[PDB]
């Protein structure tokens, strides 16, 4: 359980070398003040080299290592702070609730001139779970950051959800690292290195299969490596990784049983319908989770082959799903928990409706979860769009009115037909039309945004991505605006924004 296989040097890290290189560059940037020594990648390299504080400090003093809660960002920060000449003094924001003891653990524990007994070993601060901290603690840390005594020791914050509101006022003066340390090339190379560190002999293919198996987790990989080391297998083959054979399951192999128990008829007394009824009822009750089972049945009962050409069972199954939804709503509303004895009868009904000898493909339900995630993303898109809307035209329409009545027509208004000509060669009517276009873009607060596609060329999109809302794929494709028209209207938008800034400067 990460006993001897723990990383300790810069050659045992399991992240991509660009992120670790820029993290080490930011850590060694503090040597002018601590030690006193004298695409997005190019943006990071420009902001890490061009311009500093007068007191030899960087512009940002806190790194937000946002990502999934696993993937070993804390161990990476530990071994990098060990490599850069500092000592790791870790602290936790979840056990610290009171702001007084927080300031004891922050303003009275580190980032002062903590000249310890080891004069050649200074210290650095590493904070984990900064998203779950209360807003008073992050406001205190913001006040410490904005203190002008001066803050000299680095702060390495570990984040899990970047889009929390409590980090709305911090990331503009921070250093974001949403890198995904899931690159197997590096994971399996450091896995072979840590197998050479002890003496465990493992094939690169077997460890690559384990990496792609357990969702490129690393600490769980070290835990199961020490587990198989404790079991006594000196060599590793494809059979040793077949001890579980699924690493992306959160106990999901039982669910693939019970959906099969819904769908696959048990092959052959045991042929009585009462025995199958009781068996799939017991399996549906014993599966534990119910919402995942309901979503899998809803996403899996049409991809299965259906003999009901007259739809004599799909209507009954949809009535049953509506009955289950009504049961959930009534049991949540009335708070009477004797209504939950019924929804375990939802799978067995499917087992009566869709009892077939064939075994089609059973899929984990992705439609409902991605559907609700898409609804949340589009709703947050609507919220950001109407937050961008000026308050005069904000009150005149509801968000549903703008979504269903205005937005496609707004996209049709904002996409006329033009020609590739310069600004001074436009006529009076064309200049008035461009003035109306840029007035609409100024009032509704949208701007055309440059995007670097993975193919390499430059493309242009909307700034709040309004066309994500007001468009459908199955429609016939309309002619979009050409690239140089997007460049022209973006230049007109930015010079009109500067003209509006000059007008606001002249008025005020």
């Amino acid at each position: 359980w990460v006993d001897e296989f723990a990383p300790r040097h810069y050659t045992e890290l399991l992240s991509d070398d660009f992120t670790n290189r820029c993290l080490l560059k930011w850590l060694k940037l503090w040597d002018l003040v601590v030690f006193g020594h004298e695409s997005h990648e190019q943006v990071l390299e420009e902001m890490l080299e061009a311009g500093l504080d007068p007191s030899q400090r960087p512009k940002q003093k806190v790194a937000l290592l946002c990502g999934p809660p696993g993937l070993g960002k804390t161990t990476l920060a530990h071994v990098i702070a060990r490599h850069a000449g500092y000592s790791v003094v870790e602290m936790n924001a979840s056990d610290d609730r009171s702001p007084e003891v927080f300031r004891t653990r922050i303003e009275a524990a580190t980032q002062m001139e903590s000249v310890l007994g080891a004069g050649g070993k200074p210290n650095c601060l590493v904070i984990d779970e900064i998203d779950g901290a209360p807003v008073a603690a992050i406001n205190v840390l913001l006040s410490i950051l904005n203190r002008k005594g001066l803050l000299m020791r680095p702060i390495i914050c570990i984040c899990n959800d970047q889009f929390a509101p409590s980090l709305r006022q911090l990331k503009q003066q921070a250093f974001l690292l949403h890198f995904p340390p899931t690159l197997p090339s590096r994971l399996v190379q450091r896995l072979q290195e840590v197998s050479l560190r002890q003496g465990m002999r493992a094939d690169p293919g077997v460890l690559a299969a384990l990496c792609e198996k357990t969702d490129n987790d690393i600490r769980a990989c070290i835990n199961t490596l020490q587990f198989l080391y404790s079991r006594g297998q000196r060599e590793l083959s494809v059979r040793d990784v077949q001890a579980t054979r699924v690493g992306l399951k959160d106990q999901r192999r039982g669910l693939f049983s019970v959906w099969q128990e819904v769908f696959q008829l048990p092959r052959a007394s045991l042929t009585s319908a009462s025995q199958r009824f009781y068996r799939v009822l017991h399996a549906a009750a014993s599966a534990g989770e119910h919402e995942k089972v309901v979503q899998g049945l809803f996403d899996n009962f049409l991809r299965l082959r259906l003999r009901d050409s007259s739809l004599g069972a799909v209507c009954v199954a949809l009535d049953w799903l509506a009955f289950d939804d009504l049961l959930a709503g009534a049991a949540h509303h009335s708070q009477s928990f004797q209504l939950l004895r019924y929804p375990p009868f939802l799978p067995v009904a499917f087992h009566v409706l869709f009892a077939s000898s064939h075994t089609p493909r059973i899929t984990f339900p992705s439609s409902q979860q991605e559907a609700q995630n898409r609804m949340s993303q589009m709703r947050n898109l609507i919220q950001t769009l109407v937050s961008g809307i000026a308050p005069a035209t904000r009150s005149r329409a509801t968000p549903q009115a703008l979504l269903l009545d205005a937005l496609c027509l707004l996209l049709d208004i904002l996409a006329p037909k033009l020609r590739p000509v310069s600004t001074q060669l436009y006529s009076t009517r064309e200049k008035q039309q461009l003035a109306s276009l840029v007035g609409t873009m100024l009032a509704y607060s949208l701007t055309y945004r440059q995007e670097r596609t993975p193919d390499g060329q430059y493309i242009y999109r909307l700034e709040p991505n309004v066309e994500e809302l007001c468009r459908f794929p199955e429609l016939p494709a309309r002619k979009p605006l050409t690239y140089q028209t997007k460049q022209l209207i973006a230049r007109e938008i930015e010079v009109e924004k500067m003209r509006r800034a000059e007008a606001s400067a002249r008025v005020e």
């Binding site: 708070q335 009477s336 928990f337 004797q338």
Partner: protein
């Protein structure tokens, strides 16, 4: 002076009636000092509080009843602060009195939530040898099965009128009021098998008019008359639609009836009227639907017209079958 229930409350294990197996088992447990945590559940006014108060005054004297019995009721809100408040501190203490268990009478225990009943389950299972709880409630199904699995339950059912009428005869012999047969029939029908409402209705009939007959009880209580519902069903079954609608809405605005009470009395009436099975099924389904439509809070004239509509389809089918 005082109400009759507070005057003639039973104080002896023999003075409570129709619970003779329950009272016999309680006396058997309490003579042998084996009484568990009790859960008395049933309809209101059937003898739940008075039984356990008789058992408490059997166990304890008058002086130590106020010390080793804690009573909580509807005046106390039953959430999570109470179970970590006075009842836990009461149950987790000894007494300078004789070496016997304590007693907590918790009226209306069905109003506790699942978290509150689980916390009470913790308190009950933690302290048993020094405290014996008594949870009394209307609905058994509103409490968790763990709480049912740790305390012994007892079903305090309703009182049959055959056994209910000797106590009414005793209270009409002790208190001299006018008694007829139809007044006693109205008492044992409208009281719905519980002595508390029977004694309250009898005292209110004595104080309001002076004599107890059927029409005096019906005028003092406001219950729908049998001939009234007979007229309603006759208008629905052998009149025109506008005629029946106008007659029944005039009777509703005159007699003070409501459509829910009309619905339940008509429901009691249509199982006496010998309908065929199919039109009985149609009438019952339609009337249950009208009851739910009135429950969700709609207009009342349209549901009245739907009730008349179901009975007009009924009368067409009945005449067509004749």
């Amino acid at each position: 002076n005082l109400p009759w229930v507070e005057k003639y409350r039973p104080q002896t294990l023999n003075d409570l009636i129709s619970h003779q197996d329950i009272l016999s088992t309680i006396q058997k447990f309490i003579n042998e000092d084996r009484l568990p945590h009790l859960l008395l559940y049933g309809p209101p006014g059937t003898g739940k509080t008075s039984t356990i108060l008789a058992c408490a005054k059997q166990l304890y004297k008058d002086k130590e009843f106020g010390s080793m019995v804690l009573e909580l009721n509807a005046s106390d809100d039953r959430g999570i602060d109470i179970i970590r408040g006075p009842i836990l501190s009461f149950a987790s203490t000894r007494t300078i009195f004789k070496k016997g268990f304590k007693l907590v009478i918790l009226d209306e225990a069905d109003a506790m939530t699942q978290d509150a009943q689980n916390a009470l389950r913790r308190v009950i299972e933690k302290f048993t040898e020094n405290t014996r709880f008594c949870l009394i409630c209307n609905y058994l199904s509103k409490i968790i099965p763990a709480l049912q699995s740790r305390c012994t339950r007892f079903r305090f059912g309703p009182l049959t009128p055959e056994l209910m009428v000797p106590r009414l005869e005793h209270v009409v012999e002790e208190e001299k009021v006018d008694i007829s047969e139809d007044g006693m029939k109205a008492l044992v029908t409208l009281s719905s098998g519980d002595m508390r409402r029977a004694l309250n209705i009898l005292q209110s009939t004595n104080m309001a008019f002076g004599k107890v007959t059927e029409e005096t009880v019906y005028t003092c209580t406001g219950h729908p008359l049998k001939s009234d519902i007979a007229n309603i069903l006759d208008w629905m079954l052998n009149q025109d639609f506008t005629t029946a609608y106008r007659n029944i809405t005039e009777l509703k605005t005159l007699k003070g009836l409501a459509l829910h009470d009309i619905l339940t009395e008509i429901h009691l009436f249509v199982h006496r009227v010998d309908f065929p099975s199919s039109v009985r099924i149609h009438l019952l389904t339609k009337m249950a639907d009208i009851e739910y439509r009135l429950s969700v809070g709609t207009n009342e004239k349209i549901q009245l017209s739907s009730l008349i509509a179901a009975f007009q389809v009924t009368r067409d089918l009945i005449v067509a079958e004749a």
